[PDB]
Design an enzyme around this catalytic site. Structure first.
Site, PDB file in Angstrom:
ATOM      1  N   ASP A 188       3.597   6.523 -11.684  1.00 20.69           N
ATOM      2  CA  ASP A 188       3.912   6.861 -10.172  1.00 20.69           C
ATOM      3  C   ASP A 188       2.826   7.726  -9.633  1.00 20.69           C
ATOM      4  OD1 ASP A 188       4.609   6.856  -7.550  1.00 20.69           O
ATOM      5  OD2 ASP A 188       7.072   7.574  -8.062  1.00 20.69           O
ATOM      6  N   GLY A 227       1.883   2.946   0.260  1.00 17.21           N
ATOM      7  CA  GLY A 227       0.290   2.543   0.981  1.00 17.21           C
ATOM      8  C   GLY A 227      -0.469   3.609   1.047  1.00 17.21           C
ATOM      9  N   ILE A 228      -0.392   4.690   0.321  1.00 19.55           N
ATOM     10  CA  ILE A 228      -1.311   6.098   0.429  1.00 19.55           C
ATOM     11  C   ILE A 228      -2.240   6.245  -1.014  1.00 19.55           C
ATOM     12  CG2 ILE A 228      -1.219   8.223   1.377  1.00 19.55           C
ATOM     13  CD1 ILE A 228      -0.628   6.209   3.449  1.00 19.55           C
ATOM     14  N   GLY A 229      -1.214   6.602  -1.851  1.00 17.50           N
ATOM     15  CA  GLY A 229      -1.932   7.260  -3.015  1.00 17.50           C
ATOM     16  C   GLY A 229      -2.388   6.168  -3.771  1.00 17.50           C
ATOM     17  N   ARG A 230      -1.819   5.292  -4.519  1.00 20.47           N
ATOM     18  CA  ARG A 230      -2.294   4.051  -5.350  1.00 20.47           C
ATOM     19  C   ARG A 230      -3.112   3.156  -4.632  1.00 20.47           C
ATOM     20  NH1 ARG A 230       3.288   3.215  -8.450  1.00 20.47           N
ATOM     21  NH2 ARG A 230       3.977   3.694  -6.665  1.00 20.47           N
ATOM     22  N   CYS A 263       1.121  -0.292  -2.275  1.00 25.01           N
ATOM     23  CA  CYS A 263       1.848   0.464  -3.643  1.00 25.01           C
ATOM     24  C   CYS A 263       3.474   0.553  -3.121  1.00 25.01           C
ATOM     25  CB  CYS A 263       1.573   1.600  -4.016  1.00 25.01           C
ATOM     26  SG  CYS A 263       0.890   2.943  -2.506  1.00 25.01           S
ATOM     27  N   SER A 264       3.608   1.952  -2.596  1.00 25.89           N
ATOM     28  CA  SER A 264       4.983   2.115  -1.896  1.00 25.89           C
ATOM     29  C   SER A 264       4.830   2.619  -0.833  1.00 25.89           C
ATOM     30  CB  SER A 264       5.839   3.367  -3.115  1.00 25.89           C
ATOM     31  OG  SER A 264       7.374   3.270  -2.623  1.00 25.89           O
TER      32      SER A 264
END
Length: 400
Positions: free
Chosen positions: A297, A334-337, A331-332
């Site tokens: 995560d 839509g920012i980090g990964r 991703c979840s």
């Protein structure tokens, strides 16, 4: 290579330096450059009625000085001298040398040197260099506040997974043909990302936005989807299954989706989806879903090797289809990964065109991406992984 410090920008024009100091620096920021007018010599650019001053330095027998005074054996001692003994500009402005303006541009073939230097403790030396670069961005994120009124509307509250992660209105993806029985039907938590290439960064589908998601893929003509998360991560749901089981047919509002075939890899699974609109014939598009299901995560993948091979498959699939729309990445939040993978792909495209001897700038590329979606690339670990990705990619190109 007179010094290793990052306040040495190498080849940088005086005109160009006036911009980096006025934009990415504060009062008292300084930097050293290669003199454009006098080869061999250098220039010391200091910011100070925000002005930029160009102090020219001479290099006689590998000795440095500013026209007159005591001569130094190294350029780093010269800087330290006039930091404790400031100079006076002709306009009466004293040149207070407070903080250096560390550089972020690096020759791609010389990336290992930058990673090896960012790993040293940066000055009182509580964290590494990667940390300082990452906070220089999180600090410059304040001069990056665009309006997000569409995401904050009451009609769209249940369409956002996180209340404070919203799309910018000047890059938002606007859905046209919708449902008149909805107060708002043109909103999806997604943004268009442009450096030829464009990406769509969106959040993991909520139960009430699965239909809207496919209305974006169909509208945008997208033929490739990159999912970088599992459906569930440690009890919490990160993205509802918006595709049907293999060999199954599911209807998502006005849209029709069929999972024709799946291909399993250790790091990812490829799903061939056919997307059509109900009642409209010969509108069927083949949507390729690349599901990366081995990304932790808030951590980083095991090795950059598996991500880059995955990354290349997305590239080849895109170009194999004629006039395919933007690539949908999510991703979840839509920012980090999502940002990490987009930022990497943008840089690899720069290397695919120019070669190993090109200028890369990861903060400049991340900040350029953050102006189109809030806070892309979330953690410092993901920031270091971008370098580790490029470095591993440069090494493969140097072999054979």
């Amino acid at each position: 290579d007179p010094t290793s410090e990052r306040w040495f920008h190498g080849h940088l024009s005086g005109k160009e330096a006036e911009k980096l100091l006025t934009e990415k620096g504060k009062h008292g920021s300084f930097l050293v450059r290669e003199s454009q007018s006098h080869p061999g010599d250098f220039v010391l650019s200091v910011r100070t009625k925000s002005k930029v001053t160009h102090v020219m330095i001479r290099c006689q027998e590998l000795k440095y000085d500013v026209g007159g005074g005591e001569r130094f054996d190294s350029l780093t001692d010269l800087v330290e001298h006039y930091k404790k003994n400031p100079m006076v500009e002709t306009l009466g402005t004293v040149l207070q040398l407070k903080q250096p303006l560390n550089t972020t541009r690096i020759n791609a073939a010389e990336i290992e040197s930058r990673v090896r230097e960012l790993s040293k403790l940066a000055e009182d030396k509580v964290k590494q260099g990667f940390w300082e670069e990452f906070e220089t961005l999180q600090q410059q994120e304040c001069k990056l506040l665009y309006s997000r009124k569409e995401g904050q509307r009451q009609e769209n509250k249940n369409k956002n997974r996180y209340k404070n992660i919203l799309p910018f209105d000047h890059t938002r993806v606007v859905l046209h043909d919708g449902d008149p029985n909805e107060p708002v039907s043109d909103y999806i938590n997604a943004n268009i990302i442009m450096p030829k290439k464009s990406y769509i960064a969106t959040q993991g589908c909520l139960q009430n936005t699965v239909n809207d998601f496919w209305r974006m893929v169909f509208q945008e003509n997208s033929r490739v989807i990159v999912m970088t998360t599992k459906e569930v991560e440690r009890g919490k749901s990160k993205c509802v299954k918006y595709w049907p089981d293999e060999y199954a047919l599911k209807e998502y509002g006005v849209m029709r989706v069929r999972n024709v075939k799946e291909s399993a890899a250790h790091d990812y699974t490829l799903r061939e989806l056919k997307l059509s609109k109900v009642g409209q014939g010969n509108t069927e598009r083949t949507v390729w879903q690349y599901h990366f299901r081995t990304w932790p995560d808030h951590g980083v993948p095991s090795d950059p090797g598996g991500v880059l091979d995955f990354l290349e498959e997305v590239h080849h699939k895109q170009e194999s289809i004629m006039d395919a729309g933007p690539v949908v990445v999510h991703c979840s939040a839509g920012i980090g990964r999502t940002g990490t993978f987009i930022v990497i792909d943008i840089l690899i495209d720069i290397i695919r065109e120019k070669g190993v001897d090109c200028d890369i700038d990861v903060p400049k590329t991340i900040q350029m991406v953050r102006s189109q979606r809030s806070g892309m690339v979330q953690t410092e670990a993901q920031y270091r992984f971008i370098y580790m990705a490029v470095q591993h990619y440069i090494e493969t190109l140097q072999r054979r």
